[PDB]
Design a binder for this molecule. Sequence first.
Ligand SMILES: Cc1cn([C@H]2C[C@@H](O)[C@H](CO)O2)c(=O)[nH]c1=O
Ligand SMILES: Cc1cn([C@H]2C[C@@H](O)[C@H](CO)O2)c(=O)[nH]c1=O
Ligand SMILES: [Cl-]
Ligand SMILES: [Cl-]
Lengths: 206, 209
Amino acid sequence: MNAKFIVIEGLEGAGKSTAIQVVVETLQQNGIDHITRTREPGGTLLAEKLRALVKEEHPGEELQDITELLLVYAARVQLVENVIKPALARGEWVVGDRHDMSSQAYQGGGRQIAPSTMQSLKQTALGDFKPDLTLYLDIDPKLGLERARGELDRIEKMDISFFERARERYLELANSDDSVVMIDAAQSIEQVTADIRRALQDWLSQ
Amino acid sequence: NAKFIVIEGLEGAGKSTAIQVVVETLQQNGIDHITRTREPGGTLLAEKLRALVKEEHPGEELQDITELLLVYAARVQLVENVIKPALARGEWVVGDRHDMSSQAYQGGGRQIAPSTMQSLKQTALGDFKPDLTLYLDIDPKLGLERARGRGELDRIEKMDISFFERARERYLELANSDDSVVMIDAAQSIEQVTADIRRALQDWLSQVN
Ligand SMILES: Cc1cn([C@H]2C[C@@H](O)[C@H](CO)O2)c(=O)[nH]c1=O
Ligand SMILES: Cc1cn([C@H]2C[C@@H](O)[C@H](CO)O2)c(=O)[nH]c1=O
Ligand SMILES: [Cl-]
Ligand SMILES: [Cl-]
């Protein structure tokens, strides 16, 4: 095995942090002890500042959808170039909390930004770079918002249909991509854990 | 018919005082309401983006593509919330830098290819463009010696000389191939600069109808 980038995806409330930890422990049980964890938007000083700009409301100013996409991308470029690519080049595996699949679902599906725009901006910012394995934790939008309880950011204040379109695109990508495996996240902790731990052990042996 | 006039040039070419000349000239020809803008900036979010772009970043390297995406992010905000709405109200707009700056600095300076610049331009701004542009040309060295007189130099103002040479070189190609861009010599004196701006501007106003 050589180093890989594994991404956890899904709506908020899908138990992403449980999944991250499951993924990490699996790799450890498999003799992989050098692992880097990341989150997006974020993971660098500047990326974290961009995350805060994206999650806040701006007074006397409408945050345009394209702006939103440009910002998540600017944060993505920083992470990929300063943290992710160098870790992989050194033989360190990277486990991330969201990556580009989130822009496709949130900005593509949710904001309804033209797919052609999505495609060319992904091209300019990332070229060909892509995760090696993504675990998309799928959950019903209302169930998910009601598990995220315990303050709603600018995106989390959007109406339900927004999350439904995000979900639909997440589903279109998950079925059309063999490097994406779907996990039913509305099960109990023992079971989400079993399916993640089983889809990854599985994937590794391949 | 509201117009959007942009003043361009390397930093230190004398942009702030050229906008004044432009503003006063428009005021003599009976143009009542004018909005002033600068880029990146001009909105609370745009200003925060300006600081991120102008500031250093010990801890990490700021990639050229990130820089490009941040100036366009600042631009989309300004254009959509301030320029277009002001133009719709019958107001003229005079801005300190616009897209030509991304072409000179990110395209020429950073050497990002024209097709990348051109597709990000389409994605962010569509076919929106200023009606007139005054490019104040100046020798790069002289440009930086003047900037220093205002205050400390930003991340970008600290690049080696060739960066500014490539940007100037790009501004000149653009000034030459575009009929809506007119070049002013900033090597001249304050009177001479003021006078060419006033005349170039004067001509353009008549040659409209
Ligand atoms: C990474 C990413 C996150 N988001 C949203 C979902 C919010 O919960 C998230 C904050 O992590 O910002 C996007 O809209 N697009 C993206 O590309
Ligand atoms: C508007 C704009 C400014 N800049 C530069 C000029 C100044 O505002 C600041 C420092 O040179 O950023 C760019 O590099 N690209 C741009 O598109
Ligand atoms: Cl979660
Ligand atoms: Cl200047």
